[PDB]
Scaffold this active site. Structure first.
Site, PDB file in Angstrom:
ATOM      1  N   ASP A 129     -65.305  75.021   5.894  1.00 32.29           N
ATOM      2  CA  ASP A 129     -66.434  74.679   6.958  1.00 32.29           C
ATOM      3  C   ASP A 129     -66.874  75.962   7.786  1.00 32.29           C
ATOM      4  O   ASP A 129     -66.289  76.186   8.552  1.00 32.29           O
ATOM      5  CB  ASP A 129     -65.940  73.669   7.749  1.00 32.29           C
ATOM      6  CG  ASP A 129     -67.051  73.287   8.929  1.00 32.29           C
ATOM      7  OD1 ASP A 129     -68.049  73.337   8.560  1.00 32.29           O
ATOM      8  OD2 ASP A 129     -66.584  72.513   9.891  1.00 32.29           O
ATOM      9  N   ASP A 152     -74.208  75.944   7.231  1.00 32.02           N
ATOM     10  CA  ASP A 152     -72.965  75.124   7.386  1.00 32.02           C
ATOM     11  C   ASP A 152     -72.514  74.509   6.013  1.00 32.02           C
ATOM     12  O   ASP A 152     -73.188  73.448   5.525  1.00 32.02           O
ATOM     13  CB  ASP A 152     -73.297  73.721   8.212  1.00 32.02           C
ATOM     14  CG  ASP A 152     -72.206  73.303   8.613  1.00 32.02           C
ATOM     15  OD1 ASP A 152     -70.936  73.875   8.325  1.00 32.02           O
ATOM     16  OD2 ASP A 152     -72.163  72.355   9.618  1.00 32.02           O
TER      17      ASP A 152
HETATM   18  C1  LIG Z   1     -71.518  72.869  14.743  1.00 33.44           C
HETATM   19  C2  LIG Z   1     -71.450  71.599  13.954  1.00 33.44           C
HETATM   20  C3  LIG Z   1     -72.816  71.268  13.425  1.00 33.44           C
HETATM   21  C4  LIG Z   1     -70.609  71.871  12.884  1.00 33.44           C
HETATM   22  C5  LIG Z   1     -70.099  70.465  12.315  1.00 33.44           C
HETATM   23  O1  LIG Z   1     -69.583  69.614  13.230  1.00 33.44           O
HETATM   24  C6  LIG Z   1     -69.046  70.632  11.209  1.00 33.44           C
HETATM   25  O2  LIG Z   1     -69.879  71.582  10.120  1.00 33.44           O
HETATM   26  C7  LIG Z   1     -68.830  69.171  10.154  1.00 33.44           C
HETATM   27  C8  LIG Z   1     -67.509  69.733   9.427  1.00 33.44           C
HETATM   28  C9  LIG Z   1     -66.842  68.551   8.516  1.00 33.44           C
HETATM   29  C10 LIG Z   1     -65.579  68.806   7.681  1.00 33.44           C
HETATM   30  C11 LIG Z   1     -65.171  67.244   7.095  1.00 33.44           C
HETATM   31  C12 LIG Z   1     -64.373  66.759   8.189  1.00 33.44           C
HETATM   32  C13 LIG Z   1     -65.592  66.353   9.281  1.00 33.44           C
HETATM   33  C14 LIG Z   1     -66.100  67.363   9.797  1.00 33.44           C
HETATM   34  N1  LIG Z   1     -69.894  69.042   9.456  1.00 33.44           N
HETATM   35  C15 LIG Z   1     -70.395  67.811   9.634  1.00 33.44           C
HETATM   36  O3  LIG Z   1     -70.025  66.853  10.546  1.00 33.44           O
HETATM   37  C16 LIG Z   1     -71.635  67.427   8.963  1.00 33.44           C
HETATM   38  C17 LIG Z   1     -72.666  67.134   9.904  1.00 33.44           C
HETATM   39  C18 LIG Z   1     -72.947  68.234  11.077  1.00 33.44           C
HETATM   40  C19 LIG Z   1     -74.475  68.222  11.459  1.00 33.44           C
HETATM   41  C20 LIG Z   1     -73.776  69.184  10.371  1.00 33.44           C
HETATM   42  C21 LIG Z   1     -71.429  66.230   7.991  1.00 33.44           C
HETATM   43  C22 LIG Z   1     -70.119  66.182   7.252  1.00 33.44           C
HETATM   44  O4  LIG Z   1     -70.264  66.900   5.795  1.00 33.44           O
HETATM   45  C23 LIG Z   1     -69.583  65.034   6.785  1.00 33.44           C
HETATM   46  O5  LIG Z   1     -70.693  64.209   5.879  1.00 33.44           O
HETATM   47  C24 LIG Z   1     -68.401  64.940   5.661  1.00 33.44           C
HETATM   48  C25 LIG Z   1     -67.581  63.699   5.647  1.00 33.44           C
HETATM   49  C26 LIG Z   1     -67.670  62.991   4.386  1.00 33.44           C
HETATM   50  C27 LIG Z   1     -66.779  62.259   4.198  1.00 33.44           C
HETATM   51  C28 LIG Z   1     -66.044  61.621   5.379  1.00 33.44           C
HETATM   52  C29 LIG Z   1     -65.834  62.393   6.408  1.00 33.44           C
HETATM   53  C30 LIG Z   1     -66.553  63.443   6.450  1.00 33.44           C
END
Ligand SMILES: CC(C)C[C@H](O)[C@H](O)[C@H](CC1CCCCC1)NC(=O)[C@H](CC1CC1)C[C@H](O)[C@@H](O)Cc1ccccc1
Ligand SMILES: CC(C)C[C@H](O)[C@H](O)[C@H](CC1CCCCC1)NC(=O)[C@H](CC1CC1)C[C@H](O)[C@@H](O)Cc1ccccc1
Ligand SMILES: *[C@@H]1O[C@H](CO)[C@@H](O)[C@H](O)[C@H]1NC(C)=O
Ligand SMILES: *[C@@H]1O[C@H](CO)[C@@H](O)[C@H](O)[C@H]1NC(C)=O
Lengths: 333, 334
Positions: free
Chosen positions: B35, B220
């Site tokens: 990530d 991301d």
């Molecule tokens: C600064 C933030 C925008 C960064 C963000 O929290 C991180 O990139 C975070 C990393 C994931 C990695 C998998 C476990 C859950 C967290 N991505 C996110 O949450 C994304 C939306 C953020 C606006 C971008 C969605 C994620 O791709 C989410 O769909 C993946 C998932 C699928 C199924 C079950 C659990 C999780």
């Protein structure tokens, strides 16, 4: 050279395959069908009259936005089987995959909603030979080869089945991830058309058609496998297909019952099973299914000829060898 | 150094891309999402209550079976846009792509069924900067750099289209020219500490109707979709004529093929997506809804508001994360 350029394609309904190109500086992006049955490049115009909806419904090149456009005005009429289109020459930089190239293309200023309103794409990139080019304008591929650059003087087509990438063209080579085994090639009957000799069409075990040879155009810009009205009548009749108003149909449950159809080329048998030519949208005994083979009476000089379009390419990955004036086929994967 | 390591990934339904890491002696294997949007490493713990169903359905790290483990125990909570995990720090050896690092990572003891029961993967490998690390722990990439083995101080991502194929690939210390074409074009990071760049504008068709005046784009790899602010999205969507659902937007399947392109003006080049790139086309029916892989997500300052460019974008453009020079480069994927 030592490069290859590929273009990922979209597969719409197994009937339309198209990819992206950019035209001008900066590039304006269009969806194009890459057609071996023709040699001109064309897109809808800035200057298209908005009456015919086609233009109102397509992306139009705006030369006024191109830092690299070069005026040309020589008028053009592009005639295909389905239709015609008119406009006028223009000179600009076209990006295809990772290649950029200066190209004379047609600015499509008249574009009829039949069939154009059915097109999920904007224009066409003709992969045919100069000899078929309206305006005797150097076809894009030729222009790309001038450039040195590509590893081999060839281009390949992968068309997928509608369910993934929809397809892929590789300029300058072929991609082994999309075919099995090795190519077998059939030499062109003559430079100028991507057309080969066919020595027979079999329904199951038996040469029903083209007993004494015929022509087959390998056409990436055609949706189906087609033959003349007479050949197709005969073929359908051998299959037990009936014509339901507009098209030939089979009972969907009996699709898995139809014979294989074999195409004799280059001394081999290129075989499609019924699953490969029947649109099994369904498998009921209560529904009628369509076929992906249609009649198409193509005028001479090119015709009469069978056209091996998407239905064939889906089964056999194809390599168009300019260097040797041959076509290579391998089991798609 | 002169090493370059690659991680092969699995593509689950175009929404989850993950690879495998080994932790401990002997190695305890996990599927993780790599990530760029965060900087911590974590996997579920054998100390996670089984009252957490996500822990019942995931691979669990058991420190008691590892002879290289080093205790820490400090507590930490990890807040993501879609969920939160909680637990404590441990230290162990981790192998990733043939590289072995001693890494501090979180053993998660609280793992919400929503969303984690929906994850094919077990945990996360954050690829961000230490500036974003919770507990000030050093990120994996920094530890790998410290080793002096990588040819370059960069990592690249390839995300494939789904298949019925290689799901993806991460290259540690380079790029793989088999996966892109043309040249890289780069955007300098607004800052170190975050893989976020300046975005010049957003077009729906041709009409720069969005981000006129500038905006931010977080690149991301741990994000399934491309996302913007709720207000941004409402406008974008307005234009597409898509309908707002609970967690996503939809279009009538038949409408899908004809949606306009969407352009992202970045550093210089326009990054264009076609409907085929952002609609989940699963039929062409009139009486069926088709999701869009563009979502609304309001990310809080200090990082937000931003757009997040996740898998929807990366599938089309191969991405290089340049640490040495603090920039991101994109190239047409193949
Ligand atoms: C600064 C933030 C925008 C960064 C963000 O929290 C991180 O990139 C975070 C990393 C994931 C990695 C998998 C476990 C859950 C967290 N991505 C996110 O949450 C994304 C939306 C953020 C606006 C971008 C969605 C994620 O791709 C989410 O769909 C993946 C998932 C699928 C199924 C079950 C659990 C999780
Ligand atoms: C020697 C000729 C038969 C070659 C032929 O003109 C070119 O291949 C020409 C290129 C197409 C490309 C798409 C836009 C219309 C022109 N194909 C053809 O016309 C094909 C039938 C020829 C008997 C083989 C028809 C194509 O299958 C045509 O339906 C594709 C289409 C779909 C939707 C709207 C418009 C067109
Ligand atoms: C346009 O191109 C045609 C064909 O190349 C050419 O013969 C004609 O001279 C050109 N017109 C201009 C502006 O030179
Ligand atoms: C946990 O790790 C942090 C970072 O190295 C360290 O500073 C702290 O002292 C450790 N705590 C314990 C109990 O080991």
């Amino acid at each position: 050279g030592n490069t290859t350029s590929s273009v990922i394609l979209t597969n719409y309904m197994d009937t339309q395959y198209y990819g992206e190109i950019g035209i001008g500086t900066p590039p304006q992006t269009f969806k194009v069908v890459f057609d071996t049955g023709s040699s001109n490049v064309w897109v809808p115009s800035s200057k298209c009259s908005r009456l015919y909806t086609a233009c109102v419904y397509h992306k139009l090149f705006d030369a006024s936005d191109s830092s690299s456009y070069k005026h040309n005005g020589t008028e053009l009429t592009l005639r295909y089987s389905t239709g015609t289109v008119s406009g006028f020459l223009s000179q600009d930089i076209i990006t295809v995959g990772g290649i950029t190239v200066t190209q004379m293309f047609g600015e499509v200023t008249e574009m009829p909603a039949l069939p154009f309103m059915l097109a999920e794409f904007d224009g066409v990139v003709g992969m045919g030979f100069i000899e078929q080019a309206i305006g005797r304008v150097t076809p894009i591929f030729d222009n790309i080869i001038s450039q040195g650059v590509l590893k081999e003087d060839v281009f390949s087509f992968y068309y997928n089945r509608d369910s993934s990438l929809g397809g892929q063209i590789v300029l300058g080579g072929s991609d082994p991830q999309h075919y099995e085994g090795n190519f077998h090639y059939i030499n062109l009957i003559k430079t100028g058309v991507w057309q080969i000799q066919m020595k027979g069409v079999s329904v199951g075990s038996s040469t029903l058609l083209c007993e004494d040879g015929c022509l087959a155009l390998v056409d990436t810009g055609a949706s189906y496998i087609s033959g003349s009205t007479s050949s197709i009548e005969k073929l359908m009749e051998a299959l037990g297909a009936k014509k339901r108003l507009f098209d030939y149909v089979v009972k969907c449950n009996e699709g898995p019952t139809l014979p294989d159809i074999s195409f004799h080329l280059g001394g081999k048998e290129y075989t499609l099973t019924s699953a490969d030519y029947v649109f099994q949208e369904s498998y009921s005994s209560k529904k009628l299914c369509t076929l992906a083979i249609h009649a198409m009476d193509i005028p001479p000089p090119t015709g009469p000829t069978w056209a091996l379009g998407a239905t064939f390419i889906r089964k056999f990955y194809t390599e168009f060898d300019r260097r040797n004036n041959r076509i290579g086929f391998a089991l798609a994967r």
